[PDB]
């Protein structure tokens, strides 16, 4: 399915009253979660979340567990350093977050890489698109940036993001092909809800689609309409697919002037729906 990404997400939350931070890691290919680690789970291992990763052998699982545990300890240290940088009490819970990953084009060649870090839900430091320089949000993060420049961290990340990240994303795409390279076009339908004798709501539905990216728009007489419309956030169905709807309020009897337009990777041409039931 054209363009692809692999991304890892990490969250650590300090627990001042007792013990180590809660740490949760998740890995995605596109919109499919494939691995997790949770510091509160019994296994203390990186775990599979998709069937196509279960075929990786024990050296894989050992390695990925060693990395993710190491990463958890880095965040444990960071939470204490940051508390001091921001002159915060030892009483409060704080949060670190990191995301990193790579994109490839339809040609499965490297497109871009990324690495960003946040403290208490705000940007802290990020790698720039050139993968050679850093964006620091404030003077604490500026100290980090000098540290990481002295240690040539960007060069190490760059090698990974242009090399290993891409090579393993490609391995995953071809091992998980029957799902990861399948596009599920939205299953669409319109519903009608009388509000009063004089106005009605048309609701356009997109169901069971993958990937999650989609565009629903309403037109009246062939021109885009946003007034008197509502659009919900795209939401997971729980079975790996996504859902969305858009609605418009119309004068009862004029429903046929309105059209819903649905754009999605799985659709060679956009769909157009019209109330003519």
């Amino acid at each position: 399915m054209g363009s692809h990404s692999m991304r890892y997400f990490f969250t650590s939350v300090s627990r001042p009253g007792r013990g180590e931070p809660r740490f949760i890691a998740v890995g995605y290919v596109d919109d499919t979660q494939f691995v997790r680690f949770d510091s509160d789970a019994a296994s203390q291992r990186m775990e599979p979340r998709a069937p196509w990763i279960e075929q990786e052998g024990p050296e894989y699982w050992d390695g990925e567990t060693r990395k993710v545990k190491a990463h958890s300890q880095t965040h444990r240290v960071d939470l204490g350093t940051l508390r001091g940088y921001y002159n915060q009490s030892e009483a409060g819970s704080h949060t670190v977050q990191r995301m990193y990953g790579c994109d490839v084009g339809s040609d499965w060649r490297f497109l871009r890489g990324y690495h960003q870090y946040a403290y208490d839900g705000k940007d802290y430091i990020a790698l720039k698109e050139d993968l050679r320089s850093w964006t620091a949000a404030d003077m604490a993060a500026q100290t980090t940036k000098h540290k990481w420049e002295a240690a040539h961290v960007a060069e190490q990340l760059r090698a990974y993001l242009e090399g290993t990240c891409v090579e393993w994303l490609r391995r995953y795409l071809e091992n998980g092909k029957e799902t990861l390279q399948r596009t599920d076009a939205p299953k669409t339908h319109m519903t009608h809800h009388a509000v009063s004798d004089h106005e009605a709501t048309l609701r356009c539905w997109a169901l069971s689609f993958y990937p999650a990216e989609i565009t629903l728009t309403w037109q009246r007489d062939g021109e885009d309409q946003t007034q008197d419309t509502e659009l919900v956030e795209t939401r997971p169905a729980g079975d790996g697919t996504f859902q969305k709807w858009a609605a418009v309020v119309v004068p009862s009897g004029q429903e046929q002037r309105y059209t819903c337009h649905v754009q999605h990777e799985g659709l060679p041409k956009p769909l157009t729906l019209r109330w003519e039931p």
Partner: peptide, 10 residues
């Protein structure tokens, strides 16, 4: 496949 062996500290 995660980055390794480890991330530097901030």
């Amino acid at each position: 496949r995660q980055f390794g062996p480890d991330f530097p500290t901030i």
